[PDB]
Design a protein around this motif. Structure first.
Motif, PDB file in Angstrom:
ATOM      1  N   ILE A 152     -22.806 -14.973  48.179  1.00  0.00           N
ATOM      2  CA  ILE A 152     -24.259 -15.032  48.279  1.00  0.00           C
ATOM      3  C   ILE A 152     -24.855 -13.895  47.462  1.00  0.00           C
ATOM      4  O   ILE A 152     -24.444 -12.739  47.611  1.00  0.00           O
ATOM      5  N   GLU A 153     -25.828 -14.215  46.608  1.00  0.00           N
ATOM      6  CA  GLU A 153     -26.519 -13.215  45.812  1.00  0.00           C
ATOM      7  C   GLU A 153     -28.009 -13.271  46.113  1.00  0.00           C
ATOM      8  O   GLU A 153     -28.499 -14.216  46.732  1.00  0.00           O
ATOM      9  N   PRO A 183     -34.760 -11.280  42.072  1.00  0.00           N
ATOM     10  CA  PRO A 183     -36.227 -11.323  42.072  1.00  0.00           C
ATOM     11  C   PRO A 183     -36.715 -12.735  41.783  1.00  0.00           C
ATOM     12  O   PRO A 183     -36.311 -13.357  40.799  1.00  0.00           O
ATOM     13  N   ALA A 184     -37.593 -13.241  42.645  1.00  0.00           N
ATOM     14  CA  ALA A 184     -38.056 -14.617  42.539  1.00  0.00           C
ATOM     15  C   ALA A 184     -39.260 -14.712  41.614  1.00  0.00           C
ATOM     16  O   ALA A 184     -40.186 -13.901  41.691  1.00  0.00           O
ATOM     17  N   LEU A 239     -31.683 -18.615  35.086  1.00  0.00           N
ATOM     18  CA  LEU A 239     -31.935 -17.226  34.734  1.00  0.00           C
ATOM     19  C   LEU A 239     -33.015 -17.157  33.664  1.00  0.00           C
ATOM     20  O   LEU A 239     -32.914 -17.821  32.628  1.00  0.00           O
ATOM     21  N   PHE A 251     -35.348 -14.534  31.240  1.00  0.00           N
ATOM     22  CA  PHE A 251     -35.409 -13.217  30.626  1.00  0.00           C
ATOM     23  C   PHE A 251     -36.777 -13.014  29.990  1.00  0.00           C
ATOM     24  O   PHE A 251     -37.413 -13.965  29.528  1.00  0.00           O
ATOM     25  N   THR A 295     -38.282  -5.273  32.246  1.00  0.00           N
ATOM     26  CA  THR A 295     -37.806  -5.482  33.603  1.00  0.00           C
ATOM     27  C   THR A 295     -36.543  -6.334  33.586  1.00  0.00           C
ATOM     28  O   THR A 295     -36.203  -6.969  32.586  1.00  0.00           O
ATOM     29  N   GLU A 296     -35.846  -6.338  34.719  1.00  0.00           N
ATOM     30  CA  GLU A 296     -34.608  -7.087  34.837  1.00  0.00           C
ATOM     31  C   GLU A 296     -34.891  -8.589  34.850  1.00  0.00           C
ATOM     32  O   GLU A 296     -36.024  -9.040  35.032  1.00  0.00           O
ATOM     33  N   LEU A 297     -33.831  -9.368  34.652  1.00  0.00           N
ATOM     34  CA  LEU A 297     -33.956 -10.816  34.624  1.00  0.00           C
ATOM     35  C   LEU A 297     -34.311 -11.355  36.005  1.00  0.00           C
ATOM     36  O   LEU A 297     -34.031 -10.733  37.032  1.00  0.00           O
ATOM     37  N   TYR A 309     -27.973 -22.413  37.166  1.00  0.00           N
ATOM     38  CA  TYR A 309     -27.154 -21.277  37.551  1.00  0.00           C
ATOM     39  C   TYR A 309     -26.789 -21.273  39.026  1.00  0.00           C
ATOM     40  O   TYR A 309     -25.721 -20.775  39.384  1.00  0.00           O
ATOM     41  N   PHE A 361     -41.848 -11.099  51.681  1.00  0.00           N
ATOM     42  CA  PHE A 361     -42.363  -9.737  51.579  1.00  0.00           C
ATOM     43  C   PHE A 361     -41.860  -9.048  50.319  1.00  0.00           C
ATOM     44  O   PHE A 361     -42.639  -8.449  49.571  1.00  0.00           O
ATOM     45  N   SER A 362     -40.557  -9.122  50.068  1.00  0.00           N
ATOM     46  CA  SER A 362     -39.950  -8.468  48.920  1.00  0.00           C
ATOM     47  C   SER A 362     -39.809  -9.384  47.712  1.00  0.00           C
ATOM     48  O   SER A 362     -39.355  -8.925  46.659  1.00  0.00           O
ATOM     49  N   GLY A 363     -40.188 -10.653  47.829  1.00  0.00           N
ATOM     50  CA  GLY A 363     -40.025 -11.579  46.718  1.00  0.00           C
ATOM     51  C   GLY A 363     -38.581 -11.794  46.324  1.00  0.00           C
ATOM     52  O   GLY A 363     -38.264 -11.853  45.128  1.00  0.00           O
ATOM     53  N   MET A 364     -37.693 -11.911  47.306  1.00  0.00           N
ATOM     54  CA  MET A 364     -36.262 -12.028  47.050  1.00  0.00           C
ATOM     55  C   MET A 364     -35.802 -13.456  47.299  1.00  0.00           C
ATOM     56  O   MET A 364     -36.087 -14.029  48.353  1.00  0.00           O
TER      57      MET A 364
END
Lengths: 313, 154, 37, 152, 208, 152, 53, 53, 37
Positions: free
Chosen positions: B39-40, B43-44, B55, B57, B62-64, B75, B84-87
């Motif tokens: 499980i990974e 950022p959404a 993915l 870019f 900022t990161e992908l 992917y 809350f964290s946009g994860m």
């Protein structure tokens, strides 16, 4: 617990060697307050009033009169939880990896748990200091490939709505030009009624080198640093002015007051690295551990930070 | 456009029956979950909940990130979101998955594929098989139980 | 409860974490006590 | 929406008193009389600081952003919880900041409400006079101070 | 919070603070405006002046090209101080008001630069050369902008006779209706600065 | 041609900065790793470190080994090597990987494939995506952050 | 447990303090009331409608 | 109140008490009171239905 | 404080409104006591 968890015992016996964060020097003891929260947000409500028009002249009969409006603002501070994983030797297997004067496999770069934890914690504290100074999280010198943080998570150098001055690329060698920009920003600062407070200046090593040259024939008694201290004392009402040099900065000067009423740092009580209870164990000699830390919690008022950037083009 | 129902309910739910109580959009994860699943999180970018992701870019500052998509860019599948964290929780395409996923606006055994918007559609590159018929949640939203097992040949 | 006092005996990992936080705060206070600008 | 200052990232500075009122949260009018008629109506959409029209369809009529020959009044405040809008009828004059179409509005210009309830430079249908230049607050939000004093 | 409504006490405190700021601006500059540009000024009555626009005083204008030259600024200041006419009341303390930029310029070493003395000390000595070596006070105001104002602190030359109701005062009328929103009113009185001619020095450093 | 060669020095080296410190050949494993990752070890022929590997068969006297290779023979990715035992740590192609791999002597977003020598090249079968640009460790040694997530 | 009514304590009519006064004999008064507060569980109310078409 | 049992009696059967009571039986069967079943019940009717009862 | 109690003397309109609400509540309780199903 210490009769059952060797890793906890080792952390307790090794935590002393980890050095203090250097960000404590940039603040006063009254400007740092802990909050009991790992991930989430804190809110503050502030009220304000404004004049919508010119006042009304009261003569004869009139019932249409200019109004005074009010506004409320809610300032939100976000706190975010972050984690790192690292590999180490297993405690039962450390004996087969001890050597004449050290413990660990140099060939494979495997370490005992205590040393690995200490080094990882030091690196994480460096990252935390960099975040608190600049407001960004990255592991590249270029500063690209940044981690996407939550909104309302800022540092001293990227806080919005502050005084920002830029010294031109062709004037980077002229300390008088740099001081002209600094003086303009100092004039534009708005401390209000909380002006009487000690002030803090953070400079890069090159600027620190330029500050020791005599003030401009050249003066034979006073230096640019002395002139800067007098200039800042003029606006802080002859309070103390502290100067610090940081290798983290590159051709940037930060000036801000050490007053809790204007700038307040409310970090989480779990901000600094803390070990995690979970430990990965297999049939081999390699184990893994986790370190947790919390980022966020800088609050500042508008137009109270002077940020001078010297273009290097 | 939200994991949990946006509108606060106007009544108290009746807790009597145990059947047909799982066909809801708030059912995150999978129907059958293994403790050895990889499980990974990412950022959404957008709302890729219960959708196939790719993915994305940018300039490189900022990161992908991950955004809803499919085809040759697939992917993984997004099975949970922290707002809350946009994860976005992503299960890699190299790990098989079984659960309810968004279906394009279908009977058990039909072979499915992911479109450009991360929606499943009836068939080429991805092995996905529907285990039930489409269940309608909103006038424009349907979910289907599906098993996604890797990428097929050709 | 802090790790500075060896007499402290953590019962579980929760008390251990709280002790770590208290120790960090105490070292911050001590650093400001010993700081001389 | 109506109050964009509840997502503030930092505390504001309240030492200055000049240039402090041209904001989207400044509900009401710049000068208000005690004898101004205020009517509250249900609304659909976002009619804040725009001209409004009555829509009749079964429910009671509601108001929404509009203008032209359908202009009924001006929305000056909204309660979001009740989804209710405070309206000054077109038979009552008004002075205040209202949403403009673009930034090409200058002082002394005659203005008209468009189909979206925004004020645009110009016969005409109503008397509305710009007292200031259009001022940008958001990338697509312009406010202009206007005196609306009836119909032509 | 969602409707920006406060209790009466807090609303009154905030409104009074804003009105006091406006009154201070009027007293210093003699104009009434809520804009930083200074336009859209309320039209006032004649014989209503502030320290900065009092007629028949000494006015000096420093040119745009010399805005950074403190020596040129002091040349204009010395000329104005020579043109001051205090008559028989010259033995009095003096007051100087400067903008923040000029205040920052006043702490530089006096110009090669001279040790042990600053432009502030030079200015104080120059003013002491005309006020019979009396006290000189310096103040900084952000209401000023590239302006220097020098005047004596003597009631025989400059006197402020404000109304006893100048500061904010509540009105008795309170608008009420069937809702929970009420309206209140605040009154204040402006005017009353009296000065003898050619006793105020106003130096304007031009930027454009 | 060594993951972590041993050489004494007469001077310590100061680690001035904590950024861009991980771009070294001795950095084994993956940049981001899961506790559920499947890891194998095989006898190593040659030096397949930081390279894609293929199964190689002898004349049956000894067991099968792994050697640097790609194309249709790609079995996995070598992420670590124990030189004392000649053991190569291999992550199978069925398990996704994220880390620095040897690059043929390329920008983020470009799709990569493995060559005959186990090096990454810009394009067929492998799902390799560049997450960064090439970094030069040695005159002939280039590394790149890549994401391996199966086959098309 | 199944159906509960939680009305506001100001639901029933209450006079308002404001009274409109004029120079004539007519005055105006206001009455306030509060609506809402019925809570029920699902599938506990039977509603039969006899169509009179 | 939404999510409750609703029954409809056809127009041609609006005068047939047996049909109305059949619909009532269907709704009563579909009711779900759970373990809170031992409670008093309330029936509200209109005058025409009261006449037919 | 209820309007049923004659000794109750309201000071202001807020107390009067509170008394009205209490009176309504007491009347409801009294109605349920008197009602005989």
């Amino acid at each position: 617990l210490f009769d059952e968890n060797y890793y906890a015992k080792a952390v307790a016996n090794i935590i002393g060697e980890v050095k203090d964060p250097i960000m404590y020097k940039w603040f006063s003891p009254d400007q740092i307050e802990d909050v009991d929260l790992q991930m989430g947000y804190q809110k503050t409500v502030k009220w304000d009033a404004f004049l919508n028009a010119n006042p009304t002249t009261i003569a004869n009969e009139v019932n249409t009169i200019s109004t005074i409006g009010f506004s409320s603002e809610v300032v939100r501070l976000n706190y975010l939880k972050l984690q790192y994983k690292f590999r180490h030797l297993k405690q039962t297997s450390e004996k087969f990896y001890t050597s004449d004067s050290y413990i660990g496999d140099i060939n494979n770069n495997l370490l005992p748990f205590a040393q690995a934890y200490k080094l990882a914690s030091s690196e994480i504290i460096k990252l935390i200091n960099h975040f608190v100074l600049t407001g960004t999280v990255s592991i590249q010198k270029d500063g690209k490939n940044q981690k996407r943080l939550l909104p309302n998570m800022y540092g001293l150098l990227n806080m919005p709505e502050q005084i920002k001055e830029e010294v031109a690329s062709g004037d980077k060698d002229k300390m008088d030009k740099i001081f002209e920009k600094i003086e303009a920003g100092l004039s534009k600062l708005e401390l209000g009624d909380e002006f009487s407070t000690p002030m803090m200046v953070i400079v890069d090593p090159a600027t620190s080198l330029k500050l020791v040259k005599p003030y401009a024939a050249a003066s034979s008694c006073e230096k640019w640093e002395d002139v800067l201290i007098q200039t800042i004392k003029a606006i802080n009402n002859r309070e103390d002015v502290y100067i610090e040099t940081s290798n983290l900065l590159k051709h940037k000067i930060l000036i801000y007051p050490l007053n809790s009423e204007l700038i307040k740092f409310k970090p989480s009580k779990y901000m600094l690295p803390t070990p995690n209870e979970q430990v990965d164990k297999d049939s081999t000699d390699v184990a893994h551990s986790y370190i947790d830390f919390v980022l966020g919690g800088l609050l500042a008022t508008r137009k109270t930070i002077l940020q001078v950037n010297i273009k290097q083009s | 456009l939200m994991k949990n129902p946006q509108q606060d309910s106007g009544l108290l739910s009746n807790s009597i029956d145990f059947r047909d109580q799982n066909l809801i959009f708030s059912n995150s994860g999978g129907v059958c979950t293994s403790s050895k699943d990889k499980i990974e999180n990412y950022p959404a970018k957008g709302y890729p909940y219960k959708r196939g992701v790719k993915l994305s870019f940018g300039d490189g500052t900022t990161e992908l990130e991950v955004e809803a998509g499919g085809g040759d860019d697939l992917y993984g599948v997004c099975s949970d979101i922290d707002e809350f964290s946009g994860m976005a929780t992503v299960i890699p395409i190299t790990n098989n998955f079984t659960g309810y996923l968004t279906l394009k606006k279908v009977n058990p055994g039909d072979k499915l594929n992911f479109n450009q918007h991360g929606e499943l559609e009836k068939v080429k590159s991805v092995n996905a098989i529907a285990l039930s018929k489409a269940h309608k949640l909103t006038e424009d939203l349907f979910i289907v139980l599906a098993s996604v097992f890797g990428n097929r040949a050709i | 409860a802090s790790l500075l006092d060896s007499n402290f005996v953590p019962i579980n990992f929760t008390e251990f974490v709280q002790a770590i936080s208290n120790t960090y705060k105490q070292r911050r206070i001590q650093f400001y006590e010993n700081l001389k600008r | 929406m109506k109050n964009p200052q509840h997502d503030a990232s930092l505390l504001s500075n309240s030492n200055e008193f000049r240039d402090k009122n041209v904001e989207f949260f400044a509900s009401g009018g710049t000068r208000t009389s005690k004898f101004d008629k205020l009517e509250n109506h249900p609304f659909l959409g976002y009619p804040y600081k725009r001209g409004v029209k009555r829509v009749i369809q079964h429910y009671e009529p509601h108001v929404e952003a509009g203008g032209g020959e359908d202009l009924y009044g001006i929305c000056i405040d909204i309660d979001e919880f009740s989804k209710t809008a405070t309206i000054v009828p077109i038979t009552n004059n008004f002075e205040g900041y209202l949403v403009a179409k673009d930034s090409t509005v200058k002082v002394k210009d005659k203005l008209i409400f468009n189909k979206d309830g925004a004020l645009e430079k110009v016969k005409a249908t109503i008397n509305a006079t710009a007292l200031t230049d259009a001022k940008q607050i958001s990338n697509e939000v312009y406010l202009v101070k206007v005196a609306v004093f009836g119909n032509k």
